[PDB]
């Protein structure tokens, strides 16, 4: 547990995010923020991972399961 | 302003064959994070993760969340089944319906943490 | 069926279409699944890159022949009848890494 | 200046301190201000890419280049 | 010899070509600049299909900009005073507050 | 590819014709934009021109002390000359202002642009 000093606008942004995302606490909001700071190229990581996945044919391999448990 | 993002409800095709193959056509809540979702929308293609939704309320379990027609845009009251979570190609997105309320989204986060043993 | 185990999965609708995956649904849902789906994370041997939503599983403890990676961004709930046989299980550290990767991909606070 | 008591894991505080050292910031609080702004604008990088692409794509904007040496 | 004030939309001459821009330098610096000098402005364009966080929607007025436009704070520029031709109008205090936020976002400034 | 970062001093080309009106300038745009422009190889960077005329340092200008690596003479950043330029006008990196000098430059920008609270 720490004590931080932020501006009124900072706490307003944080509270709006926590509200929109349905998070239980400002600490949860800040955890999301830190997790975003943590991975700067995550969008790129997803693009490349999906590219590997499609290039290997794995969506065709696993697609027979897409309807399991439903219907 | 639905943009294919987390918490949004979309009608998706869950049939392996798709085409003229009937049924397996369900609403679903997007639960993949919005960096992934925004990447899929930017590329026009990707792999998202959704929680299927059913109008058969039946017995409600702690890993399922009641979704109300008043807020979601669904025609009837439904139930998100976190135990049926699955990743799908964005090609299987059919039609945006709306999004869950903030309360419904919080409880869907709870249900996911329970189903996947991610409570801390 | 327990969380963290690697199992061989039947992906047929035919021939030999079977692939390993890690069980990530909790043990009790696994015990009650046939009342039915098990939630698994696919695994691949291509480890040229390992992204933050993926976890390396070390051939020492896997039971697989080579180092692999679990692709948490490809999580899928599949019919219980597809779980053919157990091949191995991840270490406690690898399973914690998989927990973090799942929270990351699914935007889940902890 | 609003003050908060918040709970962050050891790993989270390590990430925050690493961002602080990385960005040459004076305190964890400044680090968290940066983090909150990032929270407010999740697609900012793509926003800049698209804004620059539209700007360069418009022929009515190249004229602004003519001012690059004003005052110097 | 006109006075140019922060928040005013001005028509600027880009000749070695006439474009609207919002004055964002403070009025002390502007008053000095008319006598010296450069004024810092934010270019305005009519392409409002998307309004990114470092840009501000300027709603059309009857006497000013006839169509909705946007101020692009990511294109902020300091230009020679002589280029400032005429005032077109004033952004509202709400539009200028949004422009302050866009400038702080783009320039990594707080408070 | 050279990563442009806020608070770093680059040699920039400010001539409209692209004539040896090149001079140092401090990058002041945020590093999300800067890193995007770096990653894509194109974009627009916002900089503050620097001059070796340190006759008087007004509150909207910042004294930059000379270093062994970067600027060899003391200079001043002119926040009143802030301007956005295409990335191809950034020629080569020279150095980096201190943390205190960058805070000073924050205050100078907020003063020149009326962004103070």
Swiss-Prot record, chain A:
It comes from the Bacteria. GO terms for biological process: detoxification; positive regulation of growth; regulation of DNA-templated transcription. GO terms for molecular function: toxin sequestering activity. The keyword Membrane does not apply. Induction: Mildy induced (5-fold) when grown in a non-replicating state. The keyword Transmembrane helix does not apply. This is Antitoxin MazE9.
From Swiss-Prot, chain E:
Induction: Mildy induced (5 to 9-fold) by oxidative and nitrosative stress, starvation, growth in the presence of isoniazid or gentamycin, strongly induced (24-fold) when grown in a non-replicating state. Disruption phenotype: Individual deletion of mazF3, mazF6 and mazF9 have little to no phenotype, but a triple mutant shows increased sensitivity to oxidative and antibiotic stress and starvation, decreased formation of persisters cells, and a decreased bacterial load and pathogenic damage in infected guinea pigs. One of its GO terms (biological process) is symbiont-mediated perturbation of host process. Its EC number is 3.1.-.-. It holds the Pfam family PemK_toxin. GO terms for molecular function: DNA binding; RNA endonuclease activity. InterPro entries: PemK-like, Plasmid_toxin/cell-grow_inhib. The keyword Hydrolase applies. Keywords: Endonuclease, Hydrolase, Nuclease, Toxin-antitoxin system. Belongs to the PemK/MazF family. Forms a complex with cognate antitoxin MazE9. Toxic component of a type II toxin-antitoxin (TA) system. Upon expression in E.coli and M.smegmatis inhibits cell growth and colony formation. Its toxic effect is neutralized by coexpression with cognate antitoxin MazE9. Acts as an mRNA interferase, specifically cleaving between U and C in UAC sequences. May cleave its cognate antitoxin's gene. In E.coli expression with non-cognate antitoxins VapB27 and VapB40 partially neutralizes the toxin. This is Endoribonuclease MazF9.
């Amino acid at each position: 547990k720490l004590s931080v000093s932020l501006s009124d606008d900072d706490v307003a942004i944080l509270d709006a995010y926590v509200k929109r995302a349905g998070l239980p606490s400002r600490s949860a909001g800040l955890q999301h923020a830190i997790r975003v700071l943590r991975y700067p190229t995550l969008e790129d990581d997803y693009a490349n991972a999906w590219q590997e996945w499609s290039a290997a044919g794995d969506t065709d391999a696993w697609e027979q399961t897409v309807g399991d448990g439903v219907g | 302003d639905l943009m294919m993002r987390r918490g949004e409800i979309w009608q998706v095709d869950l049939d392996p064959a798709r085409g003229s193959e009937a049924n397996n056509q369900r609403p679903a809540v997007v639960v993949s994070n919005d960096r992934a979702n925004a990447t899929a929308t930017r590329l026009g293609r990707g792999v998202i993760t959704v929680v299927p939704v059913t109008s058969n309320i039946a017995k409600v379990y702690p890993f399922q969340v009641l979704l109300s027609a008043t807020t979601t845009g669904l025609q009837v009251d439904c139930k998100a089944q976190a135990e049926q979570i699955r990743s799908i190609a964005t090609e299987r997105l059919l039609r945006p319906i709306g999004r869950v309320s903030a309360a419904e989204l919080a409880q869907l986060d709870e249900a996911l943490k329970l189903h996947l043993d991610l409570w801390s």
